[PDB]
Every structure is written in structure tokens, then in C-alpha cells.
Design a protein around this ligand. Structure first.
Ligand SMILES: NC(=O)c1ccc[n+]([C@@H]2O[C@H](COP(=O)([O-])OP(=O)(O)OC[C@H]3O[C@@H](n4cnc5c(N)ncnc54)[C@H](O)[C@@H]3O)[C@@H](O)[C@H]2O)c1
Ligand SMILES: NC(=O)c1ccc[n+]([C@@H]2O[C@H](COP(=O)([O-])OP(=O)(O)OC[C@H]3O[C@@H](n4cnc5c(N)ncnc54)[C@H](O)[C@@H]3O)[C@@H](O)[C@H]2O)c1
Ligand SMILES: NC(=O)c1ccc[n+]([C@@H]2O[C@H](COP(=O)([O-])OP(=O)(O)OC[C@H]3O[C@@H](n4cnc5c(N)ncnc54)[C@H](O)[C@@H]3O)[C@@H](O)[C@H]2O)c1
Ligand SMILES: NC(=O)c1ccc[n+]([C@@H]2O[C@H](COP(=O)([O-])OP(=O)(O)OC[C@H]3O[C@@H](n4cnc5c(N)ncnc54)[C@H](O)[C@@H]3O)[C@@H](O)[C@H]2O)c1
Ligand SMILES: Nc1ncnc2[nH]cnc12
Ligand SMILES: Nc1ncnc2[nH]cnc12
Ligand SMILES: [K+]
Ligand SMILES: [K+]
Ligand SMILES: [K+]
Ligand SMILES: [K+]
Lengths: 461, 462, 462, 463
């Protein structure tokens, strides 16, 4: 009688299992890790606190961690991103998981606490896997004593890495961490091509709007912004791109996009007069991709074309000033995670009012909120890096080191390029691709081993 | 008039070249912005630069920016087919020593580099080097090592030349510090990729006028040049297959919508005819090498290619294709300059109506420069603004005058600071009419950057 | 008050459906412009329309447009999986007879059509027909020919339906005139092509959540639906191969950048397993049928497909794929509604971890409507504005009131005039914010058109 | 051969180069060469004497020698002053074929060349067939040599503009011989007109200016077949492309294809005033391309409002799409190189060499793909010219000029080739790509109501 969980509906487990079995066929790098390390059990004794979107993809990651010896206790890192049939299957396997689609902010916090506490006392955790830094922050701020037993953190996403680096700079980071985000088989696969697959997916499921022929403004052109812009452009949208980074802006120009600012001459002085009203008045869809704060602000929201769609695909919802919209405009739910925002005011609304905006997933990550996030064959790359990161930090056993040996290892690092390449090769084989093997003379000519790595650490791909 | 310190194909093309120089200047905002900003200061006063890079219209604007900031130069091209003769003529007519013409022989190529090095039979008093591929660098280190005692730095343009510098650094044979210009983001991620996107299909069309839509291409390599080359062909409607040895680059080719194949069964290049995937190669209409490696389109691949396939290389050196094998065994028929039919029916003579032939472009030399005009001005703007900033930094450092302990700390191969990379990019963006947004103080603090930048950690790959 | 003349899944979905109808109205300017232009004229007053077409949100706006113009209707869906239950619910809640739900049996499908034809157990006094695919038209001609004596015309939505109409016409068995709505340019080259571009990858993602970039697709057919489908997949990064029997369409596939291949060696389908290009099919991750033909993904093809490939159909009827062979021979595992794993290991049982299976979507029925929502409102706006114009025209012509001698002269299958096609297109373009230029009198004179149009001869193919 | 001087080309020594490129081009034109091999034994054009007027390119060389291989005699000229490839003209003259064509003709030289085909040894040639591209030869015959039309069996016209001119003459009863509309074969219109311009428009702009196109703003006037292909030529290079149209159906396609549809005039109303120009819009355009076959679609007021240093070019058949006459009258022309001019908007008399207020005009407004590059590639022209050959055989064998008046009345029309021949051309093109077309089963052919051999579509089908 396993009861150490809470999900939406355990009877969805059989359905979840069916989709997990399909997902395993789509994740050869991760399943290959199961075969390669099975006999060795390299995570035997590992006790992992996990906080990441409880999708079918995360389900295969969890079961890969367990198959190598680990115990885990899991939550989602977003209130809307759980696939309830995935949570159900994991719970039915006898794995502690606290997650469902549509949590409140209170339930979100309570779910993280259930992974941290077992039977009212702190679990004897020794590893952390995190996506966005929320679980990392709670441990450091509320349970700092637990971190004295934890060998490391493996952090998934750009926002989480930035938070780790601030703590390292401030001397407040307690354990070593691996920047999983900056593997090329993560950042240049997950962040870019994943959003390419799943952004227009989420908009279609939410609105069923034709995108071809319409005008879109993508805020930001990093890895997420690049993939988001392509998601829309390949559908036939006329895509404009905003950036604060001139190098990323240069790439947008060369990639065939027009680079614009919401503000006249790019200066955001906070006034309505600074808004390029003629530009915003033409935009049918705006997507924030920055990891920054308030990049679709109240003045932009006021100036947007009637019936434009507004959504965010960065990690946190504060990219869009939804607070302003909750205070001043009336919200009409169309269906879960789809709201019309009536700009006529808060005192009710005319059900036939034409002056509204459509917000997706209440500003939360739209690909996971209104669809299913990245597909398995893309998450294969990210989560293979996660398993390798867990094994690397666990086998180092930072918490057992003499104090005079910890300082050398208290760091935030990426995986070595050899691991990056190993993950990439299994992905390529998954597509049926054939990689050419260098001859000894060719390897000597370009100064590499036939085994790799094939690029210096400076290389940007 | 009075000035004879040059050798170009035809000085009377100078007015035409000057007309195209004036057009190019309006297409190169970052390079002309540096010209205006530093003209008053003359930061290159006293610089004597040996330059070796494709003598194009774009290089002309580079050359005249350096002279406008106070430098004297002596110039040659780094390839036998890449010079634009009207550009060379306009430079020589401006009183600037230049030795370069389209269609040099290998002996003439070496002689041109030597005419920059030597003035009146003696070594010039050079103190700065600008190189593209390392040929000039190599000649100075091997044949004129005494000149390097007075040279303050090398600014190297391209991936192949940077590799040669890093081997010398490791060995302790590099005599002066270098800036890796190639690895500025406004170079590698602009020039190497987007440049080849523009000029690869440009060169193939000028050489053959072949329709590319619906035909089969094989791109060897998926680095920056291979990425841009694959897009150049795919946007024209080619069905593009990609070969790689780097599984990460291979992964990118898959996600970008390409089928990743190897010329060899299971990727094993064992040097036998039986290793060739003859079925795959018998279906390819166009093969392009982009690797910077050697013999990636070998003799057995050439024997296996579909009849009348086009063969070209867009990497720096021609040994990516085994053209030596073709000269030894097959008959060459010139369609027109830099376009040869290579008849696989024998070495001596050919039937004018033979159908078993390949079309080689630029005799295997860099095809975008050999059969067209290379990258466009607005792209070379970024590369060449980096070159000017690099020359300024190394000339002002005055390495050759530093104490030994200082020399040891500065003898390195380095890239320009990210802040300068961003400033080049900002001028490129404004050239397109783009508008970059300014962070609020709160937004800048939130992501931990100055409002002025730099906006990314040095680890960032873009 | 006490309306019971309907059958839907869940009437409590009505409020949800009305919210989505109000949104759809803002996405359909051509259809809503018709509603506003003709509302006061009431041109369909007296019309009684039997409607058989996918009971989607978009059909809801069509239904309420006809009612707003004066008509009474009785409605059913033309496919067992295409209904959106919240749309059906909203239409029923408005007091409009509708018999439709997602997931009907074949028996329930026929029953729903009969409920539109019969009111209180007797033939309804219908006088207009709106059909999509010809199922209702066929049932009327075969089982209720006396009702056709009072019917003024049929307006037929789709390619397969038009072909069935033209077959009846040449056989002298068609009883009332029809308008071919499919072949308006704002239908055929909008709906059939761009609609499938939007909704094909949409449905595959909802059903499987499979990554498409980098995998291999085979599209059977390259008419309007095949053109749109191939783009739906190529824009996602698939490597797409195209099969055709029409050499002109195949020519377009080549020029559009696709490799044209055949499931059969040398294109010859002799019925044996030996004719299957097994090498080609063993590399295919996804096959899509787009033909309107029969058995174009046959049993031998299904046997040769790569393990875990996806199989789907986007033509009108499920007989493009030999799903009957698979029901007879292989074991079906339901993943979720309209998604089945078909285990090629045998008919009786299956191993839950067997790797030799195919994923069939929507049991071979129209996949864009079975696994997603079909075309989006702004595309269906053009199709359904054409339907409303066609209904008005045939109802106003009053064919059924003519003497036999006059009926014979007007019995035919026609398309709408180009001037109307253009006027629908103008409202669509305005919906995007586009601005159409007006010819000067001298420009109009020069190319031989009127300033207001039509702008092209009837032979123009666009 | 010895004694042959009945030609006029730039440089006869270019013939060997031209022959080398014709031999390559034959390997790229399977549909045309298959017709040459199919009909060689029969000589279906023995006795044909063809007046030909079409761009004297390498691709036209292959068409000319196919016609001669099937028995025809021909006398040839180009249909544009800038479109001839001099090595193609040289190879044809050296083969003993009369041709009067060189790149860079004056208007006087152009008309002289057409007359040299019409006249042989000072008298009208006894021609009996016409192959035309644009209708200029057809117009000269009807207006200046009408008596020659009494012996001519037909005209085979290549392009949209020429077909419009033919239909105008038919409507007014002024057309004297029947014609085949070669343009509206699907293997012509939806191959040549669209995909040809996709290949060759960005080709010509790069050769003329070597400008980066990616990231820049383009305005394409028209979205017919040429405008569709032109817009793709630019968009696939990374340009931001806006599209202007008077036809809302073509405008609808532009929207659905992912382009923003705009007008040079406020609210699309062209009242002739400067105030009607959307000056903000045209002030952002780096490249304008006209594709309409209409008159003055890039007018003087538009040219005054264009962004500084914008490129201006036309890819429709005639140069009057751009008001170049206004520019000749008011602005100073600085030649960069042949077929590339800087137009200085600072005045007529003289210009500053470093002036920044200029436009770049390509090919002096003439069809830019043929003027600044080589036009469509051989594998595309294969389809158009296979159609031309079939059209010539049909009209010559019909022998219109030999029919009694009543039989002529039934035949005096402008027609297209049957779909079955359209399909047979497409099939050879597909095979040239290595494509494999599937054969219907008898049951399938019966299911959709076609023959296993085709035709596979009704005549109404638009593809
Ligand atoms: N939803 C998903 O599936 C998913 C996947 C990966 C990452 N993410 C999240 O998306 C966010 C972005 O990640 P990334 O990897 O692209 O980071 P990134 O650093 O590569 O890119 C962010 C970009 O935003 C730009 N930017 C910042 N402030 C801006 C402003 N005010 N206006 C315009 N541009 C501005 C920066 O210049 C930068 O180029 C992070 O929060 C990350 O965690 C989400
Ligand atoms: N022609 C131009 O305009 C131009 C511009 C820039 C650079 N280049 C030259 O092009 C070359 C490539 O430059 P880059 O910046 O792309 O370098 P890069 O290192 O980024 O890319 C080269 C790629 O080739 C691959 N490779 C090596 N050997 C291979 C083999 N046998 N088979 C398949 N793939 C193989 C490597 O894995 C690598 O990804 C260099 O010689 C450079 O100097 C030319
Ligand atoms: N699902 C949708 O939303 C939707 C929309 C419009 C039409 N349709 C349906 O899709 C079908 C196709 O419509 P269309 O307008 O594209 O028709 P079409 O006539 O334009 O195209 C069908 C194509 O299939 C080809 N074909 C026929 N038999 C073939 C075979 N054995 N192998 C390969 N190709 C073959 C034909 O040559 C033709 O080009 C019809 O059933 C139509 O009713 C569906
Ligand atoms: N250069 C080449 O290689 C080449 C090839 C084929 C045809 N052509 C020529 O190009 C021209 C166009 O041919 P096509 O086949 O595209 O014809 P088309 O009829 O298909 O297209 C012309 C389009 O221009 C539009 N148009 C007319 N006036 C306009 C205006 N004022 N503003 C905007 N749009 C306007 C029309 O609505 C029409 O859609 C003809 O002169 C033809 O002979 C040139
Ligand atoms: N499907 C997914 N599962 C987990 N994390 C994700 N991030 C983006 N997509 C995801
Ligand atoms: N959404 C939709 N509604 C009705 N008919 C359709 N046909 C295709 N998509 C449709
Ligand atoms: K997913
Ligand atoms: K250039
Ligand atoms: K829909
Ligand atoms: K050509």
C-alpha cells in the first residue's frame, strides 16, 4: 500500500505507462545510459531531491535514475507543467511524487516541502536535481543543515544557473553544482529546437489561431528567442525581434528578421509616450523569451492591437506584467490556461467586447502550460546530461571530503566536452545518421584524436 | 605616375574599382565608423603593416581604413584566384603597394608575398602583420625570422590560420603575439556562416548556371562554413545531405532538417574502393567541402560520383579535394576561366561530346572567391572592423619593445574583448535600420549586467 | 423552452462552445461581412437546408450565418471523428437541430444523417443541401429521391464530393444542380493547401508529441492537399519524399525541393511483395496519404514500413490506407482516443513491450480533424463565405419550381463567378491588415481589365 | 562554313566557348533533347521557314538547333537589347544559322536586327512560321509586312505579355494567323515564370551590385507567377519582403505565403499626387522589383520617395514598368559598369562622385534576370522550349495558310497545347531529376475516373 505521493488521479497510471513506453523508444541516449551503467549501479545509495516539470519525459529520467540505484522524491517546478498521466504512472511505480496540473502557489510550495520532508523530518537526501533554482533556494534558506549531507546540485536551465552563479560570487553556495544547461546537447538542442517544436504547438492548442500572414513580436533572441522566432516564422508569421544584446540582434538581422524596439529609439523611460504605438498596434502575437523582468510591460499591453495573443516561454511569469492586468482588466476564462483580458475595465465585461487580449497559461511557460513542452527525442539530450551530471557529482562525494579539500571542488561547472559528444552521437544514431571516422592522418592534420574531443573548449558551434 | 611599386593585372581598371569602393563604403558602417572615430587620433601612426588577404573590393576598404588611421602597408592576396582586378588597380592607383591579380601561378603567388616583405631588395621595416590563412606568417617565421624581432603582432583572419598559430604557440616557435580575429562573434558567426550562405550558390551559378532546385547535394562538414554552405544550397531547393566527424555538429545537422550520411560504409575510411558507399555517391549532383582538413573528397569518392556532378571546395586550401589524382589520371577541358570539365575516360585527350565528366570549380580553390566575389561588403564589414581594432590594440601594446618578463606574459593568441565585439555588432545592426533596446537599471541589475554591456558571460555560445 | 430535437455528447459544453464561437467570429471577416451585408435582406428566408459537414466551431459560424440570413437547417457531421463536442453543444443550445459527436460508430453516423432528413418520423420539407464529401447527397439520391423533387440545389465543399457529383452528371443520375465550392480559388488554394499546412503537423503533435525535425516522411500525392501537407512537414525540419502519379504535380514537387520516389520498384504496382521498394520504406518514419484515391498505402507497404513509423490519412475517406488488412491480421493497442499501436507480431495478443508496431492515427480517418481541430477559423472563413454565396444563388434560382423542360436546361455543376471569388479574397486580405492597390484607369486599360475587376481570365491558374 | 556572312554578332571568335556551353546545356535539357531524338528521323519541320525573336541565350541556342535538326530553316533575333549571350549568338552564327543579336543593342540596332530576319537579300523572306517572345516580331509583321502573313501558318508565342497582345488582336479582328499560347502550359507558366525567376532574380542582383540581401527590406510589385517566384528569390535569401497587388486573390496568396501586403499609395489610392505616396513606407525600402506586365507601377513619385541608395529593377517583359524616362530627364546617370547605373537625385547637370542621394538602377529598367545575369537556367527552360517545339510542329502541320477561307475561319484562334502533351513534357523533366512517377493500378485509375496513361486532371485544374 504505497501512499507516499499526491497526484491528480492515480487511475491515469496505465495511460501514462503506455506513453512512457513510447517515450523510451524516442530517447536512445537516455535508454543507452540504462544499458551502459546497469550492472555497475553507479547511483546506488544516492538520494535525490528532484524538482522539474513532471512530464512523460521527466518520467523516463526518474526511472533511469532509479534503474542505476537511486531513491528519489519528486515535484514539478511549475504549477501548470505537469502531465497528470505521467505523475500517476510514477506514483503507481512506488516513487514519491507530488505534482499535478493546475496547482495553486500554496500547493506548489507544499509539494516541494513533501519531497524535502519524509514523515515530518528531513529526508536524508544527498543529491539535488533542479530546474530554475526554486528547490535550491529553499534548501539554502530554510534547511541549510541538509546541505551538509548533499554532494551536489545538477541544475537544468539558464535561470537556475544564473542564480547559482550569484550565490557562488557571494560565497553563499554550499555545495558544488553542474551547469547542465550549457552542454551543447542541452542549450543548443533543448532551449532552441525544443521551443521551435513546442511554441506554435502551444499557441495552436490554446487558440487554434491561424498564424500564417499575421504579425509577431518576439522579445529576446538568445537560445529560446532563436527557437521561438523560428517556430513562428516557419508557420508563415511576419516576425519582428527585440533585443538588448547587439550581437544577438545582429544574428536576428542575418537570419532574416526585422529588429525593433517597443520603445521609441529603444529608450524605456516608463511613459506611454515612449511606446511605439504604431508598431505595437500592428502586433497579433507577442512572446517573451528573456529570463528578465517586465519585458512586456503595462504600457506595451495597453498599446497592443486588439485581440492580440500574449504569452511567455521564459522560466518565470514576471516577464509579462500580469499584476497590472489582474488589477485593472476583467479576466474571462475561455478554457483552462486560456483567458481573455478585457481592456474596457474591471467592472464586468460585455461578452461581445472586441477590445480584449488573449493570455496563455496566465503568463507561465506556455509550451508546457498549454501543450506538453519539448518532445522526448529532444529531452533525450537534456536528461542524458542530467544522469551523467548526477553520476559525476555523486561519485565525487563532496559532503564526505575533508574541509581542507572542499574549496577546490566548490564550483559551478559544465560537463566535459567528451560527455557532450557522447550524448550527441547517440542522438545522431537515433535519426539513423552515420558519423564519419577520421583517419589517423586527418586527425593529425587538424590536431585532434580520432576519439575526440573534436573542438577546443572555446568553440561555439 | 612616377609610382611603380606594385604589380596588378591592369591599372586602367582603377576608376571602375574606385566606383565600387565608394559603393562598398556605404555598405560597411562599422568599418567606416572606426574610420571617422579614430581619424583625428591617428592610432596607427608609425605602423608598417604587411597584409596578405584576398585583394577584393572589401579588402580595399580595409586597406584604406588602415592608411586613413596613419598606417603604411604592403599588400598581397592570400589566394591565386580571389583578387578582384579592379580593386587591386584602385589600390595601386592610390599610391599603395599591392601585388595581386586574379589567376596567379603558384610561383607568382609566392613572388607577390615576397614583394611585400622586400622593399628595394632588402626587408621592409615592418612592425605589424595582417594575415588570412598563415602563409605570410609562415614565410616570416621560416625565411625572415629576423624581421619578427621588430613586429608587434599578427592579426589572423580565418580558422585555418588560427590553428597554425596555436600549434606554433604550443611548440614555442611563435615569435610575436596574435589576435584571433576569426573567433569574434561578429566574425565567425557572421563571415564564416552567413558569408558562405550568400556566396556559395552565387559562385556555383556564375560558373555553371546550373539549376539547383530539386537536385542532390552532399556537404562535407557542418562547422560554421558547412552550416552556411548547407543553407545556401537548401534555400535554393536542393536536397542536402551532410557528412561530419563531430557528433555535436552532426546533431545540429539533424535538428536543422538534414540527413547525415558518410561517404564510407559505416563511416570507416579504410582507403579501399570497397569502403565507398557507391549507391549514395552515384546519386549526388553537387559536392562541397568545408572542413579545413585534408583529402575529405578523395580519389575513390571522385571515381564514384554521379556523371556530370559539380565538385568544389569552400575551405581555405585546395587539398580538401584530391585534385592531384585528377591531374594525374583524367583529361581537363576548360569551359571558361575557373571552370573545367574533368573527363574520367583517360589522361590524354577527350571526346568533346563525352558524358562521363565532372565539373570542377576554381581548380579546387575557395569557390566563393574563385568563381564569384566572396562575401558581400555588409558582411565583411564585421570581420574588417575586428581587424582594425585588433591592429590598433597590438600596435599600441608594442610587444617588440617590452622587457623580457613582459614579453613572456603577453606572448599569446587571444580574442578581442566582448565589449568590442558588441560595439561592432551594434553598428552592423544600425546599418540594417535595426533598433536595439536599452535595459532599465532595474532590468540590468536583475540579470547582473551593466546597462552598457557586456551582456553575456565569456562562456556564451550565441 | 423544451427543445429536444438534437443529439450531442454533452449539452453542458454549450457555454464553452459559445465562447469559442465569439472568438471565431472575429477570425472570419468574409463570413461575418456576408452576415452583416445580407441580414436585412433575408435572402435565405424560406430555405430549409440539410447540412452534412464536420461539426466544428468553424461550421458553427457557418450554420449561424445561414440562420441569420433566414434559413432553417438540420445538421450532421460528415465524419465520425471530426465533431468538436462544444461546438455541437452550442448549436443545440441555440435551438438548432444537430446530430453529432466525436467518436460515432458507423451505425450512429448513418443514424445522424437520417435524423436531419427526417423530422418526427417523416421526410422534412428540405429544399437545399450543403454537403462535404457527398454522403448526404448519395443517401438522398438512393433512399429519398422524392425529397430531391423539392430541392433547389447542392453546394458541395470538397474535391471527393465534386468528383462524385460529376460522375452522377455524366451518368444522368444527378437530380438537382450543384455548385462546386471546392474550386473557388479562395477555397481550393486556401483551404485545401494552407489549411493542411496548419493542421497536419498540429494533429501529429497532439496524437504522438513526436519530434518531427530530422526524421523521414513520405507524402503520397502532391495535389493541393499534398502540397500543403508536404510543407507542413518540411517547415518542421522533416526530410520529405513525395509520391505522385501525375507527372505535372511531380514536376512541382521537384522544383519545390522534394525528392520524388515511388513505393514500388520503377513505379510498377503489380500486387506482389517483390514490387515493394523495401529499402525505401524501411527508412520512413511517417507516411501521409493525400490522394482521394483507394489503397495508396497498401498492405505490402504497411508490412515493409520502418518499425514504430506513424501512419495517417488526410484525404476524405479512410480507404486510402488498407486498415482492413491490419484489423484482420494485427493486434491493436489503444494508446488514447484516436491513437493506436498496431502490433505486427500477430492478431491474437501483443506484448506490451513489443518493438515491432506502427502508430495509426484516427483509425485512418481525416487526421487533421480526428486528432486536432482541422483548419483554423481564418482559413475556413474563405471556404464558408463561398458556401453562403453558393446557397443564396441556388436558392434564389428556384430550380425545383421549373417545368421539366427548364430543369433539363439548368441541370449542371458550376463554380461561382470570379468577381465573387475576388470579393471573398478582398475581405480575407483586409483581415490581415493588407492593403490592395487600385489600378488607375490607364493601367486598367493597358492590361485590359475593369478597375474593380475581375483581374484575370477564367483560364488563370494562380 | 566557307562564305557564310548572313549574320551580325558581337564577336565570332566566341563560338568555341559557346559550343562548350551548348554541349553542357544539352545535358540539362532532357525534355527538349528527347524531342530532338524522337522526331529526328521523321523531320516534321522539313519545309518550315521560321522567323524567331527570343533572347539569344545558350538555352535558345539549344531550341534553335533542335528546330533545325527537325528540318526547319530559321532567321533569328533577340527580343531584348540586353538579353543576348554573345557566345551563344557566336556559336549559332558559326553553325551557318542567320542570327542578328548582341548584348547592348541600341533601340535602332534592335529594330534593325528584326528586319534582317524578315528581309533576305533585300526582299521579304518566304517565311511560313513565327516564334515570338513579347509580340514585337508579330507586331512588325502585321503593321509593316502584312502581305508576308498570307504565307505564314502560325505564331507560337512564349510569354504573358505577348499572349495578351495576341488576344487583343483576336478581339479586334486584326489577327491574321492562328497562334499557340505557349505561356499557359503548366510546364511553362508554373515553371519558367515562377521557378525561373526564383533562380535568376537574386542571381542578377548579386552579379550587378554584390549587395548582401539578408536583413534588408524589399518591395515586390505584383504577385502573379513572376511575382511569386521573385518574392521567393528574395525571401529565401533572408530579405524582409512586402508585396503589392491589385488582385485580391493573388494578395490573399501573398498573405498566406507569409508576406505583408502593402501599397505604395495611402489606402491603395493612386491619384497622381505626391501626397498620396506612403513616404514612410518607401523610405524604408532597400530594393524594389516590378513584376506586373503593366505600365508605370514604379512611378516618378515613388522613385522620389525611395530610401537613399535603394536598388531599382524590373523583371517584367518591358521597361515601362519603371518611369525611367522621368529619371533620364531630371537626374544624372553615373555608370558603375555595364547595366549598372547610379541615378543621382541631386539634379540633371553633373553629380558629386561622393553624393549619397542616389538610386541604383539595373539593366536600365530592362528584364533584370537576363540583363544582369543569364536568365532562367537550362533545366527550367527545357520545359518552355519543349512546348515551343511541339507548338511549332502542330501549327506547321496544320498548314493554315494553305486552307480554304471557310477552313481558316474555324482555325483562326489562340490555343494552348493539350494537357496530355503538357504531361509528357513534365514527365521527362521529372526523370531528369531522377524522380520516379508511380503508375496507377487499373482499379485505381477506374476509382478516380482516368486512364492509366493520363490525362490525370480535368482541364479546369489549376495545380
Ligand atoms: N520554456 C522552455 O521550454 C524553456 C527552455 C529553456 C529555457 N527556458 C527559459 O527561457 C529563458 C531564456 O533562456 P535562454 O537560454 O534563451 O537565455 P539567453 O541568455 O540565451 O537569452 C535571453 C536573451 O534575452 C535578451 N534580453 C534580456 N532582457 C531583454 C529585454 N528587456 N528586451 C529584449 N531582450 C532582452 C538577452 O539579451 C538574451 O539574448 C530563461 O528563463 C530559461 O530558463 C525556457
Ligand atoms: N571560403 C570562405 O569564405 C571561408 C570563410 C571562413 C572560413 N573558411 C575556411 O573554411 C574552413 C572551415 O572553417 P570553419 O570556420 O567552418 O571551421 P570549423 O572548425 O568551425 O568547421 C570545420 C568542420 O569540419 C569537420 N570535419 C573535419 N574533418 C572532416 C571530415 N573528414 N569529414 C567531415 N567533416 C569533417 C569538423 O568536425 C568541423 O565541424 C577553414 O579552412 C576556414 O579557414 C572559408
Ligand atoms: N483533410 C482536409 O482538411 C481536406 C481538405 C481538402 C480536401 N481534402 C481531401 O483530400 C483529398 C485530396 O484533395 P485535393 O484537393 O488535394 O485533390 P487533388 O486532385 O488536387 O490531389 C490529389 C492528388 O493525388 C494524386 N494521386 C492519385 N492517386 C495517387 C497514387 N496512387 N499515388 C500517388 N498520388 C496519387 C493525384 O495525381 C493528385 O495530384 C480529397 O479526398 C479531398 O476531399 C481533405
Ligand atoms: N523576365 C523573365 O524571365 C520573365 C518570365 C516570364 C514572364 N515574364 C514577364 O513578366 C510579366 C509578368 O508575367 P506573369 O506571368 O507573372 O503575369 P501575371 O498575370 O501572372 O502576373 C502579373 C500580376 O501583376 C499584378 N498587377 C498588375 N498591375 C499591378 C499594379 N499596378 N500593382 C501591383 N500589382 C499589379 C496583376 O494583378 C497580376 O497578378 C509579363 O510581362 C511577362 O511577360 C518575364
Ligand atoms: N517535456 C519537458 N519535460 C521536462 N522539462 C521540459 N522542459 C521543456 N520541455 C520539457
Ligand atoms: N475546421 C473545419 N471545420 C469544418 N470543415 C473543415 N474542413 C477542414 N477543416 C475544417
Ligand atoms: K512532450
Ligand atoms: K564581394
Ligand atoms: K479549427
Ligand atoms: K541561363
Amino acid at each position: 500500500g504505497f501512499t507516499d505521493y499526491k497526484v491528480a488521479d492515480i487511475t491515469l497510471a496505465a495511460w501514462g505507462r503506455r506513453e512512457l513506453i513510447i517515450a523510451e523508444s524516442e530517447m536512445p541516449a537516455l535508454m543507452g545510459l540504462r544499458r551502459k551503467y546497469a550492472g555497475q549501479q553507479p547511483l546506488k545509495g544516492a538520494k535525490i531531491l528532484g524538482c522539474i516539470h513532471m512530464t512523460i519525459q521527466t518520467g523516463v529520467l526518474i526511472e533511469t535514475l532509479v534503474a542505476l540505484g537511486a531513491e528519489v522524491r519528486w515535484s514539478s517546478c511549475n504549477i501548470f507543467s505537469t502531465q497528470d498521466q505521467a505523475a500517476a504512472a510514477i506514483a503507481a511505480a512506488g516513487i514519491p511524487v507530488f505534482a499535478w496540473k493546475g496547482e495553486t502557489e500554496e500547493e506548489y510550495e507544499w509539494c516541494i516541502e513533501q519531497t524535502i520532508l519524509k514523515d515530518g523530518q528531513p529526508w536524508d537526501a544527498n543529491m539535488v536535481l533542479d530546474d530554475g533554482g526554486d528547490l535550491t533556494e529553499i534548501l539554502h534558506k530554510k534547511y541549510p543543515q541538509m546541505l551538509e549531507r548533499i554532494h551536489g546540485i545538477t541544475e537544468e536551465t539558464t535561470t537556475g544557473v544564473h542564480r547559482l552563479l550569484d550565490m557562488l560570487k557571494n560565497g553563499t553556495l554550499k555545495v558544488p553544482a553542474i551547469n547542465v544547461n550549457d552542454s551543447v546537447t542541452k542549450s543548443k538542442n533543448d532551449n532552441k529546437y525544443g521551443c521551435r517544436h513546442s511554441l506554435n504547438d502551444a499557441i495552436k492548442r490554446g487558440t487554434d489561431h491561424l498564424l500564417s500572414g499575421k504579425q509577431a513580436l518576439v522579445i529576446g533572441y538568445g537560445d529560446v528567442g532563436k527557437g521561438s522566432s523560428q517556430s513562428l516564422r516557419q508557420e508563415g508569421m511576419i516576425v519582428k525581434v527585440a533585443e538588448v544584446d547587439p550581437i544577438c540582434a545582429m544574428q536576428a538581422c542575418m537570419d532574416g528578421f526585422e529588429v525593433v524596439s517597443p520603445y521609441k529609439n529603444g529608450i524605456n523611460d516608463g511613459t506611454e509616450a515612449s511606446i511605439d504605438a504604431a508598431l505595437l498596434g500592428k502586433i497579433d502575437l507577442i512572446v517573451t523569451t528573456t529570463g528578465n523582468v517586465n519585458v512586456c510591460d503595462a504600457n506595451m499591453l495597453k498599446a497592443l492591437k486588439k485581440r492580440a495573443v500574449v504569452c511567455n516561454i521564459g522560466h518565470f511569469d514576471n516577464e509579462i506584467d500580469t499584476a497590472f492586468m489582474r488589477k485593472n482588466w476583467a479576466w474571462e476564462e475561455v478554457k483552462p490556461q486560456v483567458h481573455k483580458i478585457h481592456r474596457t475595465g474591471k467592472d464586468g465585461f460585455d461578452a461581445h467586447n472586441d477590445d480584449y487580449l488573449i493570455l496563455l497559461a496566465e503568463g507561465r511557460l506556455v509550451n508546457l502550460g498549454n501543450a506538453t513542452g519539448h518532445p522526448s527525442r529532444i529531452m533525450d539530450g537534456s536528461f542524458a546530461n542530467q544522469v551523467l551530471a548526477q553520476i559525476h557529482l555523486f561519485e565525487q562525494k563532496y559532503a564526505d571530503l575533508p574541509a581542507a579539500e572542499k574549496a577546490k571542488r566548490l564550483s559551478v561547472e559544465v560537463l566535459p566536452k567528451k560527455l557532450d559528444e557522447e550524448v550527441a552521437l547517440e542522438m545522431v544514431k537515433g535519426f539513423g545518421g552515420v558519423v564519419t571516422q577520421l583517419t589517423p592522418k586527418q586527425a593529425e592534420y587538424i590536431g585532434v584524436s580520432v576519439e575526440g574531443p573534436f573542438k577546443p573548449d572555446t568553440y561555439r558551434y
